[PDB]
Symmetry: C2
C-alpha cells in the first residue's frame, strides 16, 4: 500500500531531479521499469496509476484519488504524458512502462528505475528508487547511507 504512495513520491522526486540537472527541457520521452514486488503487483493494481499521475506532479496528499484512474486512461488513450504538468510528451505503455516480474534490483524488492530520453533517442539520465516502510522513498545511492 506503499505500492501507491511511495511510487508517486519516487516519480515526484524524479521530476525535481530533471529540474535540478537542467534536463527537463531536453526531455522528450520517459521510461519506467518496476521490479520485484512492485512489478509483481501488476498492471492495473495501483502502481502504474500512482506513478503516471506522480510524473504529472500529482502528489499523494495534494491529489484527488477518484481522478487517478480516469487520468491514467486519458494518458494511455491520448498517448500524451503531461510531464511535471508543464510539457506534453509522447507516451507508449508497451515501451515506457515495464513490469519486470522476473527481475530484482539488488538493495530491496520494491525497486524502480526512471529514465529520460531526448528526441534523438539519447538517454539523459537514469535514476533508481526504492519505496520502503509506510512508503518513504530512497535513491539507490542513498540507500545505504
Amino acid at each position: 500500500s506503499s505500492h501507491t504512495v511511495g511510487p508517486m513520491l519516487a516519480a515526484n522526486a524524479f521530476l525535481q531531479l530533471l529540474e535540478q540537472k537542467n534536463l527537463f527541457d531536453k526531455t522528450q520521452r520517459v521510461k519506467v521499469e518496476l521490479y520485484g514486488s512492485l512489478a509483481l503487483t501488476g498492471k492495473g493494481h495501483g502502481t502504474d496509476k500512482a506513478i503516471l499521475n506522480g510524473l504529472e506532479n500529482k502528489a499523494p496528499e495534494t491529489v484527488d484519488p477518484a481522478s487517478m484512474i480516469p487520468r491514467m486512461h486519458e494518458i494511455l488513450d491520448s498517448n500524451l504524458l503531461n510531464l511535471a504538468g508543464k510539457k506534453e510528451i509522447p507516451f507508449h505503455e508497451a515501451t515506457d512502462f515495464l513490469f519486470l516480474q522476473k527481475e530484482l534490483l539488488p538493495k530491496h524488492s520494491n525497486g524502480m528505475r526512471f529514465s529520460a530520453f531526448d528526441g534523438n533517442a539519447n538517454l539523459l539520465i537514469e535514476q533508481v528508487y526504492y519505496s520502503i516502510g509506510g512508503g518513504f522513498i530512497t535513491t539507490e545511492e542513498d540507500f545505504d547511507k
Copy 2:
C-alpha cells in the same frame, strides 16, 4: 552483414565471459536487448536467429545456416535454450529477447546488451557489445581503445 555474423560472435564472446568469470554454473536465465539499427531490423529478420544460435555456441564460420531458423523455432517452442550447448535453461522471448527500437546505446547504433541472472532473479553480469565494419565485435569498454 554485421547484422548476423557480428551478433553471433557477440553471443559467443558472452559465453566465454561467463566461463572466464566462473558464472556459467550459477546462470539460470539469460536476456538480450537490441538497440538502434539492430533492434530496427525486427523479429524474424536475422539477428535473433543469429544471437540464439550463438548463445548455443554455434559460430558463424562453422554453424550450418540451414539449421538456424529451425533451431530458433525449437528454442521458442520448447522455451529451452541450450546455453554454450552444455545446459538447457528456461527461455521466454517476451521476456528475454527485446527489440528496443526507440533507444540508442551511446557509442554506436548497432548495440547489444547481454545479461545473465541466477535462479533467485539476481543479476550476475551485464555486457554491452557493438558490431562494426564487416561484423567485427567490441565491448563497450574496449570501444575507445
